[PDB]
A and B are shown apart, each in its own frame.
Chain A
Amino acid sequence: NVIQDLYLRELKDTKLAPSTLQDAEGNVKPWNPPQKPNLPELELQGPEALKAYTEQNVETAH
């Protein structure tokens, strides 16, 4: 009775409208795309290495 009256008026006449998308955006973590997986360079370059392996190793002795 009183329930029906209060409800009818209240629901019908009160229906909120959300805040701006900007305001929603502010309160959340938005997203931006991660880039770069890492690019390293080829290990121990050149014939510096070739000479290093040949020359350095002779690691045997009496």
Chain B
Amino acid sequence: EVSSILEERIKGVSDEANLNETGRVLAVGDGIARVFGLNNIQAEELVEFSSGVKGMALNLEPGQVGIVLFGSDRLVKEGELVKRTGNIVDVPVGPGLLGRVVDALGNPIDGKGPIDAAGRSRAQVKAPGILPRRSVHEPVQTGLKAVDALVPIGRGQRELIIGDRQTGKTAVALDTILNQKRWNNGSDESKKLYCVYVAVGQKRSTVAQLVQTLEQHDAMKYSIIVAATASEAAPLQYLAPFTAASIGEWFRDNGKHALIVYDDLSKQAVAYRQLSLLLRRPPGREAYPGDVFYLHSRLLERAAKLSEKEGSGSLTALPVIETQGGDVSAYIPTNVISITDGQIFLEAELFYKGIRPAINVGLSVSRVGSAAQVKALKQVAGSLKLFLAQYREVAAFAQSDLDASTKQTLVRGERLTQLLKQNQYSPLATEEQVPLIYAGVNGHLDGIELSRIGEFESSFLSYLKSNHNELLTEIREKGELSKELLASLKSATESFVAT
């Protein structure tokens, strides 16, 4: 009992040490121990103090090496041996991180078990070249019709999620993982997206809810949750996306696919600000380092859909940037906006108007496009974009007397807006994405009252399954919409509108 624990603990200090190169603290202030020694010292090398804390050495000054502490100053005191671990920051990579909430070092903070790892690989690894890359054909499906069709996303792709926190910023991200559960079931490991959620500056109480939610929806078993909490030190926060990416490279390398969602790189920036200011390295615009751009570029360009040269595998990424007014002007947004391909712009107005989580999809864009979209889903959702496009313009005359054309647009558009509403943690199969957009396109939703859109949806889907889940199964398996199948589908929808 207490004894079993004692034996373990004593075993854990059994086997005498034998020191080598040390440094000694001259003075320690503000997480910047200034150490005399460490003559040889790799850059970004891990050094372990005699207070046991670990550090990296961002300033290698000529006669003293200004270590950056990954922890509290209380532990450190003057004249403290600072052993040189002699290993650049590395984190385990391997399948053992699957279903594990780990700290940056890789220690399971959920304590679900030690990481099975085939290597520990260094935190910052250079981006894969031009010729290692290949065009993205594979779509990634979030089970949200609007995201999958209006903002078509693939695998390898890096695309922004700029929006305001707690509007279910995390919820939008989580929804994808759940629809990816479907794909995960699908044997191929380009369909097994082993997702990585990088929780930056997020309190343990919140992250406890997240972990539990993932487990609830039984998705925490191909998940990895890299946790750098609000209180967790700024080196850990800074290197947390970098180290996390290295895990991602292992999946990508193995030809598998995975999705890494960095939430929020804004707090990664803030941590770097703390580091830089304390290292006296000048803070850039808005007191946020200027080579934060350089960091973001290195991190985000490791996300790639590889070619068969390096095996066709990928590392999808979805960085999340938190805005306080939608101020894209702000230095950290401007930089990230430039680096990312596509943007998702989630907006408050919609939230109030009952779309929760709320996305303004007029101000969302894709710059990777429908090449990462199902052919079927593309076919029956070109129309949708145009109707909605008109709807935006003709929403600016909606509030009376209106030409029939304008009024018609409003009828289809209001029904569509209601259909595109979605509530947290509801993923929806592609074989049910394809029918719903078709109905709206054919204006079959127009007749069924706005309030009755909700009723229409569930009923329509069940009716489609009853009438022809053969048709639905054809949509899924063929992956393409044969004219005969859309003919039948059109008839089916008409029949459903009738009852």
Contact = CB atoms under 8 A, between A and B. Distances in A.
Q: Do chains A and B touch in the complex (CB under 8 A)?
A: yes
A36 interface: no
Nearest to A4: B14
Contact of B16 (A1, A7, A15): A1
Majority DSSP secondary structure for residues of B touching A: helix
Interface stretch (B2-10, B59-67, B227-235, B404-412): B2-10
Sorting the interface of chain A by its residue count into under 10, 10 to 19, 20 to 34 or 35 or more gives under 10
Interface string B455-481: 000000000000000000000000000
Nearest to A15: B3
A15 to B, nearest CB: 7
A3 B16 contact: yes
B196 to A, nearest CB: 39
A3 B13 CA distance: 7
Interface string A11-42: 10001100000000000000000000000000
B3 A3 contact: no
A11 B6 contact: yes
Contacts of A4: 14
A4 to B, nearest CB: 8
Contacts of B13: 3
B10 A7 contact: yes
A8 B16 CA distance: 16
Nearest to A6: B10
A3 B2 contact: no
> Most chain-B CB neighbours within 10 Å: which of A1, A4, A11?
A11
B9 to A, nearest CB: 9
B16 to A, nearest CB: 7
A11 B3 contact: yes
A9 to B, nearest CB: 12
Contacts of B16: 1, 3
A7 B14 CA distance: 10
A10 B9 CA distance: 12
A12 B452 CA distance: 76
A16 B2 contact: yes
B253 to A, nearest CB: 42
Contacts of A15: 2-3
> Most chain-B CB neighbours within 10 Å: which of A1, A3, A10, A15?
A3
A7 B2 CA distance: 13
Contact of B14 (A3, A10, A11, A16): A3
A10 B248 CA distance: 46
A34 to B, nearest CB: 32
Contacts of A1: 16
A17 to B, nearest CB: 11
Nearest to A1: B16
Nearest to B13: A3
Nearest to B12: A3
A18 B7 CA distance: 20
A7 B13 CA distance: 10
Nearest to A8: B10
10 contacts: A3-B10, A3-B13, A3-B14, A4-B14, A7-B6, A7-B10, A11-B6, A11-B10, A15-B3, A16-B2
Closest 4 CB pairs of A and B: A7-B10, A11-B6, A3-B14, A3-B13
Given A3-B13, A15-B2, 14 more contacts: A1-B16, A3-B10, A3-B14, A3-B16, A4-B14, A7-B6, A7-B10, A10-B6, A11-B3, A11-B6, A11-B7, A11-B10, A15-B3, A16-B2
